[PDB]
């Protein structure tokens, strides 16, 4: 769902995370393909993601306003829905937040989690 112009706001935070975390881009469609372990080198990038937007802080705490409002009307009822479950996080590290996150939203709506 993600807008074609989001994609060079991201470009060079993306870059940065997948390099400081040993990120390949096979690791990120498989997230996208709703496959997800957890292997910090896909986890971190992803909180590294997260923290690059804005969306989480220090502690791998989620602005969920800050979330819901990067996302499509039509996908925010859904959304809320699920960080309703989801969140607030919890984890070994911010990294291990994100993964358990991740897998909270993919098993409960598998269409809200997408990995730029
Ligand atoms: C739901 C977020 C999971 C990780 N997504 S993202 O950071 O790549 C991202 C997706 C969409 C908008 C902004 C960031
Ligand atoms: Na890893």
């Given at each position: 769902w993600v807008p074609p112009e989001v994609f060079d706001l991201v470009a060079e935070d993306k870059a940065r995370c997948m390099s400081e975390h040993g990120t390949t881009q096979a690791q990120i469609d498989d997230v996208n393909k709703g496959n997800l372990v957890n292997e910090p080198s896909i986890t971190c990038y992803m909180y590294c993601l997260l923290e690059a937007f804005s969306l989480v802080d220090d502690?791998?705490?989620?602005?969920?306003?800050?979330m819901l409002g990067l996302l499509p009307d039509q996908?925010?009822?859904r959304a809320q829905s699920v960080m309703g479950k989801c969140l607030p996080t919890s984890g070994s590290d911010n990294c291990n937040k994100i993964y358990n996150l991740a897998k909270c939203v993919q098993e409960s709506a598998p269409d809200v989690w997408f990995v730029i």
């Open positions: 502690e791998a705490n989620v602005d969920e306003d800050i996908l925010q009822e």
